[PDB]
Amino acid sequence: QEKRKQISVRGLAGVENVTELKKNFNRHLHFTLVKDRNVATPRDYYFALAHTVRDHLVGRWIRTQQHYYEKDPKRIYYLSLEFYMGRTLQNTMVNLALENACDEATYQLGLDMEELEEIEEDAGLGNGGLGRLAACFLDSMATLGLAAYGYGIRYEFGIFNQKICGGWQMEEADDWLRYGNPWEKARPEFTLPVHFYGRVEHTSQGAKWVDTQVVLAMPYDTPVPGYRNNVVNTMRLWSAKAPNDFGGYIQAVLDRNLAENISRVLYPNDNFFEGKELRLKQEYFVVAATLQDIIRRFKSSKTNFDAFPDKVAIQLNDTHPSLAIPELMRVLVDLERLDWDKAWEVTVKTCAYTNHTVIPEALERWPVHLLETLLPRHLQIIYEINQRFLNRVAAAFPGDVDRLRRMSLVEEGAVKRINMAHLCIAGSHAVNGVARIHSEILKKTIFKDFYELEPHKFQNKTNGITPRRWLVLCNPGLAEIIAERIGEEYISDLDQLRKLLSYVDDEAFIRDVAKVKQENKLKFAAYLEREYKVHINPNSLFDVQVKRIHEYKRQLLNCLHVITLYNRIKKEPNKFVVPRTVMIGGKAAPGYHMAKMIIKLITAIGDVVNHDPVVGDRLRVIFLENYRVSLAEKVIPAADLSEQISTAGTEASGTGNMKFMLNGALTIGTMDGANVEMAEEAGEENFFIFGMRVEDVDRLDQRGYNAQEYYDRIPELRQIIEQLSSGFFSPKQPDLFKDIVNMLMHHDRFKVFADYEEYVKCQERVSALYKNPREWTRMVIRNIATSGKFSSDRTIAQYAREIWGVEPSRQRLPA
Amino acid sequence: QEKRKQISVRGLAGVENVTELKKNFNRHLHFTLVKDRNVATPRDYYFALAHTVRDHLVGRWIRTQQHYYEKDPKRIYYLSLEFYMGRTLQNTMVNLALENACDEATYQLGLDMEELEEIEEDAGLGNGGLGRLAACFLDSMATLGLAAYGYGIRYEFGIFNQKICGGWQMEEADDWLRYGNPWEKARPEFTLPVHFYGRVEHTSQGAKWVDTQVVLAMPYDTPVPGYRNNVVNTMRLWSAKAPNDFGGYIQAVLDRNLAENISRVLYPNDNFFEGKELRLKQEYFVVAATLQDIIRRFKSSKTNFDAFPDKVAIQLNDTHPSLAIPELMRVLVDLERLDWDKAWEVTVKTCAYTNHTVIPEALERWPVHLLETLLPRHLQIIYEINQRFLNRVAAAFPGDVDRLRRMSLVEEGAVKRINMAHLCIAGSHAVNGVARIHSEILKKTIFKDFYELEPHKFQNKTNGITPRRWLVLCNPGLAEIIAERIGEEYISDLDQLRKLLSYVDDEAFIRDVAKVKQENKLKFAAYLEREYKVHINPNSLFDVQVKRIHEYKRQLLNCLHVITLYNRIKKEPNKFVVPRTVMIGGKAAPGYHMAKMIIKLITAIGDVVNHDPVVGDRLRVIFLENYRVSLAEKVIPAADLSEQISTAGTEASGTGNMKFMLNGALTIGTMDGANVEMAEEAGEENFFIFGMRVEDVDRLDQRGYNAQEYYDRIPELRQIIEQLSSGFFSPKQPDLFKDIVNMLMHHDRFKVFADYEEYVKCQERVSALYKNPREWTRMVIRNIATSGKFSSDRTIAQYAREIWGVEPSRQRLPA
């Protein structure tokens, strides 16, 4: 479009810059793609543009890394099993100020750059929140000029591609590397050995881990550009490779696949613990290879290990990389021959742990038999850690035997296990939750004993989202009308959005905020037609719940509300209601029967609602297939209403909530996770808060939750349960939803019925405000204006000052 | 070196060409390798040079392929399971005239280009002769301006890397793609489906192959540059990929490995038949993907199929791609719905078959049960082919029932099999052997019945070697002293080497030929020290036997001779003998116990000979480890004597014989394969011919070979057998060589003892001529001078005119 090149926030199309970009595009098309414009497909054109844009990172990537070598600042290592990065082309162009120059260059070559962007595969190397947080954090650490390295696994297959067939989830391999990855640089020369199995012999010098099987770890380095500060940091992802040397010769060559299977695929369980050996191998693989890099980089700097914590921070994203603690002790004691006590002092000052959930089924509790087989030295070191840790508990709390049993790294039972969260707290100088309410819940419930031993360890770091991906990239319309009033500094100083409260009565801004949402809604609706032949009413309220499918997130409560709207229309057909397009999307874990049945119930409700001629365009319900970072960038800027309806106490933070607030949706939600802080920043008068508070949930748990009480007292609820139970939503198979009905009536841990009436009444308040466009938009302005706290720059600046001990900086390197 | 830049055959170092090469080298080092000269290793420098040289292919590669589209000449498809390509960097620089310019460019950057060349991995995608012939053929077809495409498999692992440990072969995976392949272009956009298993339903339109498992075939295209004619042809290698859509989700993602195992590794059996299902899958994979390309390319040209043979030749390199015949019939009949008879007329005019051995254990005879399971439609079509073929035999030879049984594609027995050689002859308009004697042996023995039915089918095409790789690349010294007298035209017109017979009495040339061999011997000896701490006497005769280890090649006869020289020294220590360095190298098939014992016997003989202080530097025996194309380019130009000592009738052609003749070694050999034609070209007076002729072997077979007769009549032979038997060469394990002794005495199919006395006497004639340097060199001149027939340009020109029906051309395209 002509209009989009006019957007100032997208930078300058310098005449020489355009000329060079076209020359380099054509050069890559010829020498890199080995095509000419005769045979070139849109995919060749995307790749020619990606190689051209990637060439602009290289000088800064080399200069940044040389700068870290020269200045020797403290290095931050962000260890994660997941980096939900999404696409790279737009992000690179935004962060290097090339967006308008590439748009003009490709326009002059007769190409639509927006069409080329849609060709790129997501780097879908995460499940959801925790993975996307890692991605926002790498972006913020680069923008803040930290010497920061993401370390993870280069999965051959990311989070599965979700197809919906017959209204059911089907899973397909996410072959994201099919056409190559133009961003990464293979570093086979920096390949490192990782050891498994074997046994411990305790010799003269001490212990020795021998008779191991070797898997090599080959690093692939991806650039991470800061926002217009010429900083380019590194994400290093390890790929598994069979060792050089060794059924027959042929079978031995094919058996190289077993070692290489370690980096084959992301576990799609959204943090729910499965105890798979292959998952333990992935966790050890990332930790072992990463810590060898850290130790090597430390020794080749301006061996004595007292300075190690002054030069190294290791941030553990959940317990997934918790083996970092025993592995660093193994390296320091067995290989560097430090005394246990010195090694432990170093380890604890180096390591910090971030907890992302209180849900007990998320907790990693590895069988000791599995650890003894796979990692015999690690289990010895863990027992030693536990003995010395519990000695300290006994000394602080003499005779508190119950506290010793509760705090032990070792869990007794049929199967003896190691609690990896207890290991993380024992081995870390800082433990943080990811929202104020969550960090308090840690100190009062699941880590109370640890808090009483070492209160100074416990911190809060409220999550955030990068305002580059989550406003400038995905919503350039909104970024522009904001820049037109307060300039561009807010893009890396998001608290400046508070200036927008000066505009709540400004006729032009009220007009502009509503026009941007309408433009976003027209574009998203076009898509739902062009690529899925699905019609949506563009004058309807876009009611959006997008996140992984879990009972705790209560997609089912949204289902009860949708059926309530259908049933109220059928009862009073002549009564006006605010038209709604209810959009639910998200992946279910491939096992999880209940999650898959919930997806089927959403599509089944659609089958009835969407074909009822009495309803027509007044209510539509659509399951958004294959929800992922790229789709989030499309639907979130188009949303009117943000569904954040987890049972109070279950969602640690959320980050999708923050994306919606930044992009001009109003929120309906419980007082859970960061929804509490979002309501506080904006004022509760500007949020649709409903339902039980954490205290209310605890009171119900104390007397026992009886779903029958709610069914017996709420006629509209009885009608819906009777429709699901009798087969109104599955006439060819009347018993289809019996398991959902049985769970809701008898085994509902997330108290869906207890929030049903407050939810429905809150949703009437949403409709009532939507009927007043001007007042809807003024409340939106009050939300966008107060979304600044939820920048990951704020979050990372807190990690840097309160945990890592490094001072952030927005000052530019040269180019 | 300063001297090597002076070599005119290596071309011009133009000042602007040098300037541009350095600029492009530095550009690739920065943008492609993402390094600077601070951290760059020799391997980064090799890759920067390879990308720079590869950029020079691209325009010509695109223009050549556009030219074939424009002119629509008949296309030649060379189908092979093997392309033994070796390294590409030097070959590319020679064929584009860039060698001196890159040498000067890298010299000016402070680098040694020869050192960078040694970093490149061989593309070791073959076993030996047949694979290397495919590689010489692609080079010759490009040099002759044919519209020719090599089609094969992109094996992840080529021919195993051979280590020698304890004097034994050990096999390691040839991870040739570890650091990437800068030559190939991945073409994932041109990926094609290949079908396996399933069943045939015979419907209204006719047969339909349904319920199949799909494996995708992803092509990788490698450039094949002609010699200074601006032609760049394509080698397309298929890689196996799991189909996009589908133990659990995780196991299903890991199970993608089973389909991908099809292209994992080259079968290392040097043509010996094993009947492995995975090998049958590889053969079908290459044929099915290739024939879809051929059919598509045919339909998109200037559907009617009568012109198909005028636009397509398919050359079958051995029976490995024999399924091309039933697959083309399947496509034409089942998918294009041609009548059987029209389809068959097309298939036979399209297909031709090259036979590479008479040894019955090489013959592919697939169980019908395996074909019925894997390829049910192919087996139906093969039976139909057989019925109609045998109908024709019955009509030509009425009542010859024995001939029907002998000629059938179907072999009866405990296990019913398909004879793939019989299928190839039935389905091909031409059948060729690879040397005059071999092609006659085919018409008189194993294909006599087929010859009597269709004599016009049977041709000879004597093998050849490319004089680019096998003289200009590997022996620039020799190429230069030749160019100094007759100019450069001989490099693509090798018959011009006959001009050198004018120089047999030229003092300067005699001096120069001997100086080049000495320079080659000094360089090879340096290597045997620098990279293996092995000392060799540079004034010794370099006696070289390099080829795959097989009983038929009689490395054991060479062993008997070496022990004879040792025993004669010990008996008369004071008697002068011509010092020898006896070098034997080659890979044994990983199964093949006897081949592995023969390697151990060579190293064991070395252990005694090389440490006997009475022998000292008068006799040394070394096993050259990991013999492969790159090592052949080093040892062959250094050789004095070429060992070509196969039992008469067993070696179809040989090509290593031709390499040695071209590079100034004299030959000791039997009248076998192309040794016969080499002796004819040079004159037998200029070859060390010995032993039984084919007629002599047949006479022995008629009365029965009794090794005992030879043992009883030859004292020197008895002494050696008694040394092997008693444990003289294995004192710590006296019975080590009992199996070799038992085979030689009782089960020797290759009549080693029958050629022993003539071999030893012939070797005395070699020593006697070596004592006269001037006469040795004059006989070398007479060999090099007559080596011109053995150019693969001569061979390919015969294929083009006598089988493919296309006229070759050495005329230049524009650049």
Ligand SMILES: O=C(O[C@@H]1Cc2c(O)cc(O)cc2O[C@@H]1c1cc(O)c(O)c(O)c1)c1cc(O)c(O)c(O)c1
């Ligand atoms: O459906 C349209 O886009 C799709 C939806 C969409 C969105 O909701 C937000 C966003 O950030 C990008 C976005 O890209 C989508 C898209 C898909 C394509 O296949 C494509 O070629 C393209 O240009 C784009 C569309 C229709 C239009 O009529 C149009 O003019 C346009 O620019 C775009």
Ligand SMILES: O=C(O[C@@H]1Cc2c(O)cc(O)cc2O[C@@H]1c1cc(O)c(O)c(O)c1)c1cc(O)c(O)c(O)c1
């Ligand atoms: O051993 C030397 O080379 C090795 C043997 C050899 C050969 O026999 C023929 C040939 O075509 C090339 C060839 O490359 C070998 C080689 C190996 C290396 O590791 C290397 O760095 C190199 O420059 C080369 C050598 C010694 C020398 O003293 C010397 O000056 C030289 O140029 C080379």
